[PDB]
Amino acid sequence: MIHFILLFSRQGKLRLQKWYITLPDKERKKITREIVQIILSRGHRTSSFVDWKELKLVYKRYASLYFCCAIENQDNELLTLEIVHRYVELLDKYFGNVCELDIIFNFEKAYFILDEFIIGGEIQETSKKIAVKAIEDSDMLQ
Amino acid sequence: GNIFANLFKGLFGKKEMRILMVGLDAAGKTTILYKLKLGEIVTTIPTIGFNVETVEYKNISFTVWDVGGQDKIRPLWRHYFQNTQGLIFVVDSNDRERVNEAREELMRMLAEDELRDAVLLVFANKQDLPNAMNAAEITDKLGLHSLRHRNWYIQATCATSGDGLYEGLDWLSNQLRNQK
Amino acid sequence: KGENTSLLHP
Amino acid sequence: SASAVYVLDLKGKVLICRNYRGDVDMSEVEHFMPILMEKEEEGMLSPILAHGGVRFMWIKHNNLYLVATSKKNACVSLVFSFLYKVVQVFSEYFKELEEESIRDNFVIIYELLDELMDFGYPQTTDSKILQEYITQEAPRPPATVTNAVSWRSEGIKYRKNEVFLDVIEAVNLLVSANGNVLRSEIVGSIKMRVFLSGMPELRLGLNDKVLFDNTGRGKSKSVELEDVKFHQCVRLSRFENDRTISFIPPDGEFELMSYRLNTHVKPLIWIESVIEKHSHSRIEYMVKAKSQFKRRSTANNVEIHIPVPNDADSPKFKTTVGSVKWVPENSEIVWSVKSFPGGKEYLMRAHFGLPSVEAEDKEGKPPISVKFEIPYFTTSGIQVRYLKIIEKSGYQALPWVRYITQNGDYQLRTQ
Amino acid sequence: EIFELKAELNSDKKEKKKEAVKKVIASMTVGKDVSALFPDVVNCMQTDNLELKKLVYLYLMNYAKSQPDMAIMAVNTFVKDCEDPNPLIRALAVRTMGCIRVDKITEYLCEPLRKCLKDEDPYVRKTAAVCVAKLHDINAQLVEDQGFLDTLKDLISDSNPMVVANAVAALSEIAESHPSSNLLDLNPQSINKLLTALNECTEWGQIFILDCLANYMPKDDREAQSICERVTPRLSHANSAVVLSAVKVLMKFMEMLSKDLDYYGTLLKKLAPPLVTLLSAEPELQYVALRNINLIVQKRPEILKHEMKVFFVKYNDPIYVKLEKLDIMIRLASQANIAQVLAELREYATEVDVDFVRKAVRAIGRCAIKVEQSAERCVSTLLDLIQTKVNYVVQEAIVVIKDIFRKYPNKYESVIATLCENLDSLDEPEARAAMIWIVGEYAERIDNADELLESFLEGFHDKSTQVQLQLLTAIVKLFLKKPTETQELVQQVLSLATQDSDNPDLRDRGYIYWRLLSTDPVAAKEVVLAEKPLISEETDLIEPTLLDELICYIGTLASVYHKPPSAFVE
Amino acid sequence: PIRLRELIRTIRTARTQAEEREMIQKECAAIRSSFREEDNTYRCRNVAKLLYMHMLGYPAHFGQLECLKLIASQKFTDKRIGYLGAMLLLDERQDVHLLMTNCIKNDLNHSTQFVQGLALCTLGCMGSSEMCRDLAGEVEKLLKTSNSYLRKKAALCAVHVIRKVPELMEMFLPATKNLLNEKNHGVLHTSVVLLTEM
Amino acid sequence: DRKGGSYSQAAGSDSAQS
Ligand SMILES: Nc1nc2c(ncn2[C@@H]2O[C@H](COP(=O)(O)OP(=O)(O)OP(=O)(O)O)[C@@H](O)[C@H]2O)c(=O)[nH]1
Ligand SMILES: [Mg+2]
């Protein structure tokens, strides 16, 4: 299960955040700052895997804005990367040429897509088209 | 400024008002709210959270926020004290041991300085068993006459029958509205 | 800028 | 003994750098931003940094922090004074202090930086004198810099000889929450805008208590200024001998002397405020302001800042006189009064809501600050006696001066 | 781009040359490595327009160390520019020559420096004085061979007060790096001459003129009195550093002045108003002023004895200023303003700065320890703070009470009952250990000392080493004082700290306690529960040798950090 | 009622941290003023602005009762906004999610497949030690349904309840029996995850 | 006129002190 997922920009600004662990607000902010500092203080050949606080922190940013996850030491590491790539592809398909500008304005849509895709740190839909159809149907409800 | 629109709205009815629904668990609060809104005795599970509804009568939209009597939900009634205009308390005369607890809870809720404009609304619930007292013995036990600067009104309503609900609504409208 | 660019460019 | 004075930006980019000794590598500026971030995030942020054997002592300007690298045990006070002089020069040359002028006036900025300080030792800092040698739109340097008089350029000719003075008063009161005033000091400010022909030698004369005692007139109202800070044009020896204020006024507005003495009189404005804040229910502000100043004086633009709750919403103000507005950016009730006659009494009754849910952390109790500014009122009672304007050619001057009374550090401690 | 810029710079049109120079300056300022084009700009060097010459000189100075070989094509240009009729051009050329960090270029610049040393233009004289110091710093041997020391010495004895101040500053810088051999010290005539030009010096030259007197040591009171009288007018200078320099000079001269004469009293009286005026400076200078006051406070505490109101921390005061205000108040704390200090500390305890709150608690404890006349007031304030129900404030109050009890525990029995139930659930190691020590040493006014220690013995083996040692000491003291109610508790503590305790020091202490209990419990009363001697408090006053050395180092980095100049430089 | 895009542009227009904080406070003042009046028309915009401010690093304690009020609303947009607020600013240590149990129970029996799914997702994301105790009976009812879009949500809710309440795993043994023949990949994955967790 | 107090003419010296 994914302990937390945070979408942080290259400048350090966070465009998305979804933590599956009930933590204090100050503690959550400190953890996010530490994760940003570690990721922001990492090179391009670090393997995109960090063991921070015994958590498999995997970083794989496809643009200026990076992505982060908190995976416990009980599952494979490539599965998290595959899930992140699938989520990025689904978000791009739902939005259409998803860029940084649309992420800030359409943060609610991204949060709804993440909720409909992953719940509680675990996956909810392995397919990429069924989730998109469900999201479109939910949006069309008004 | 011009108040022509306000006068036009008031010519056909504009005031709506608000209301609160508090009381102990299993006190007929959910059933009373269902009867007021729908008109049928709907059987519901204990109110873990809260119920919010509105009643349209006499051109006034009486919005009712039902509140349960759970121990963990008793101190949560302070959340509904903000932006609240009315307050209706439903008594449970069928619980002799819980009568003291209900009176203590009513005193604790009435001892708040923010909830001052909410007039007292005592509802004689569970008016279907012979063990239920009259409309004065319960008031005498609760000492409703000792509430200084409080406009309280005791009304007995039978959950199975529904009698007295119209009288209670009329009394609430007369207390809230000071016009013809 | 660098923000208008697509996340994956697909 | 600064090694390299540089100008940074809000994003860490160095707007301009100018090494003076070269004892510090220019790449050390990269660690300045992370060091500042660490100090601020851990509470260790200070104006003087330290990157190993090199210290980064600088202050933060309007838009950028002027960091000046140094390696030896240089005079930190000298570095601060040089930074202040540079800021003043930039303000005089450029009306705004922002990155818009840093990237647009580099041609003159570089020349000014090179001319101001050489080898870490500044030599010229007069903006008026410096404007005659470096221009953004070169002749020989003026003789004023080489001559002893570096604050009065020769050859200045004007149609009239009018000097405008400004006796600005600063009423600073440190009133504790118990109702007692702890820090009650008034600092005089004699700012003059001299505009005459030539280089007159002003002979300042006021009603000082020390001067009256020395001359034998220590019986009338005399100002007992604890500290008097004369300007560069004022001769220190003349003041030290017999309190003779003899100096050459410059061309433009400048601060000649700055009096500063303690105040033992009653406050001009007495504020009686009450806080009937219910526990997450409501709040009351029984604020009453009593003007203890003279009735003949009017406090124009009275702004008594009343700190309201940070999470308070739906506020209602029941006051008597003056516009009352709550600013969400400042999170306080601004008791704004246009004209406040002396002896006036304003009563206010605040009423604002509060959320039922308590706040996660405490926000503190900001003090109540009054922004009263009553002109034509000399609280200290110091009056100018004479101003000896003497010129070699000989002319009749028309000096002018005005007294302005305002509130300085006049904050009231909250309960 | 680069090719286009080179073509523009290799053109015969001044209009395009100026644009190319501006673009090159912007690229370097924009963060572009334009050092590859230094030889290209070398050809466009001798220009009549002064605007392009300054940019070229700046580029050469900034592109001198990167390409020292390419800088060999500028000596002739510098030599030609060193004789320009315009004083500004000569000054710029002299500044650029000294700014060029080239080892093979300074050798050929000795002749222009010698020619410009006797320049009639005061700006030229100052530029030559700066260039001589720069050359000496770059190459001391070359400067010594050139014999510029004699010219520098005569520079102070010439006209142009700004040039004299610049020469004095250059000589001080050279002697600062010099090994003190062949010092440039001057007799009283030189000091009088400098004082004569001191009143004509500018704001920057005033510091240079006053720094010279910082090294000179007066030998007679008349000379010291004259120096004090001449430096007295400097206390009314608008420049904060000038006032600070004058104060430092007066403090240095006071080491030879006689306190019997009225000069010392007048100097002490005239120094407080200067400190008060400096206390109203900018927030950046507030820390420097506080450091200077602290350095001078430990030397002459009789000057600022009555200066207490100005030490109050303001609401908008900076954190670096707020922290220093507490230290200044503690250094100036006395029974005369004990109530004012307590009131200020009480107000400072309602702030939101956790570090500020800890600093205020430490200052209150230090004031309570230093002055015994306000011990009751400090105890009452600590009790009120503890009743304030603040975790950090509770820990600070516990630490302060633990410190005070070891210092003045004779009349500290009236607070044990209040502290018996003060929310002992706090897990702060500095507070739990202090509470345990207070209970163990003060286990007489609390009838439930054994019951309170029972809760702390649940995790004694895994709480901490210091906490475990304090708990063991408290248990041993309770057993020695009252062994009837703690007979089994002592055995349990010995079993837990001797069998299940793996700490070396803790295990040794437990074994020693067990041996003492099994050898002679009666002797443990006089051995363990004995009357300890008076605790020697850590004096905050610096050593007199450091204070005397720090007195001369006024306004520098060694004074703000309160460290020796050789202990912080690299 | 300022739009979310307008608020985002206004925030992006602020450069200084102090200026950004001042703008955030100015927006929060209007948000609190609207909330204190019991606004129900433009509540979605205010909720979005409050969520953005909280994610940007500003307090949102006062916007707690508004989320509870909007959760028990009937509008789909209002219900979605309330669910998002409960998922973001609501946690086990918040202490205000206890009243959300009744709202979840009311929405757990909703005929709409989106409201029930949103409530289940919110319960799984913010599962509490007491909410799962009073919600175990309703969770098991949905686990036996044939809704493919709801089977995965029911499996996730059961897994979350088991993780929060390890002693409640005994009530899920008879519900997951004979569930390995699901044609949908998501249902099979959820069943496999639930079996592995058990 | 001018806010903060109208400007007033200043004297030349203390005529009463010689
Ligand atoms: N048969 C009968 N039962 C009644 C009557 N009046 C009250 N009750 C009891 O009161 C309960 C009413 O519960 P609800 O309608 O769900 O609402 P509530 O009174 O607020 O109870 P909670 O939800 O637990 O807070 C029923 O379960 C009945 O057992 C009545 O007139 N006849
Ligand atoms: Mg009910």
Give the topology, please.
This is part of a larger assembly, with seven protein chains of seven kinds.
Chain B: H1 4-11, E1 18-23, H2 29-37, E2 50-57, E3 60-67, E4 88-92, H3 96-110, E5 122-125, H4 137-142, E6 154-156, H5 165-176
Parallel strand pairs in B: 1-3, 1-4, 4-5, 5-6
Antiparallel strand pairs in B: 2-3
Chain C: no helix or strand
Chain D: E1 2-7, E2 16-19, H1 32-41, E3 55-60, E4 65-70, H2 76-93, H3 99-102, H4 106-116, E5 117-118, E6 121-122, H5 127-130, H6 143-146, E7 162-175, E8 181-195, E9 201-206, H7 209-215, E10 227-230, H8 236-242, E11 245-247, E12 252-262, E13 269-272, E14 283-291, E15 298-306, E16 313-318, E17 323-327, E18 332-341, E19 345-353, E20 368-370, E21 373-375, E22 384-390, E23 398-407, E24 411-412
Parallel strand pairs in D: 7-23, 7-24
Antiparallel strand pairs in D: 1-2, 1-4, 3-4, 5-6, 7-8, 8-12, 9-11, 9-22, 10-12, 13-14, 14-19, 15-18, 15-20, 16-19, 17-18, 20-24, 21-23
Helix content of chain F: 55-70%
SS element count, helices of chain A: 5
Bound molecules: guanosine-5'-triphosphate, magnesium ion
Structural class of chain A: alpha+beta
Largest sheet of chain F, described in full? none
Question: How many strand segments of chain A?
Answer: 7
Please tell me how large the radius of gyration of chain F is: 19 Å
* Strand line-up of the largest beta sheet of chain A: 2-1-5
- Topology of chain F as a string of helices (H) and strands (E): HHHHHHHHHH
Q: Say what oligomer this is.
A: part of a larger assembly
Class from secondary-structure proportions of chain F:
mainly alpha
Distance between the termini of chain A: 32 Å
PDB class: protein transport
Keywords: nef, AP, trafficking, protein transport
Entry title: beta-Arf1 mediated dimeric assembly of AP-1, Arf1, Nef complex within lattice on MHC-I lipopeptide incorporated narrow membrane tubes
Chain A: AP-1 complex subunit sigma-3
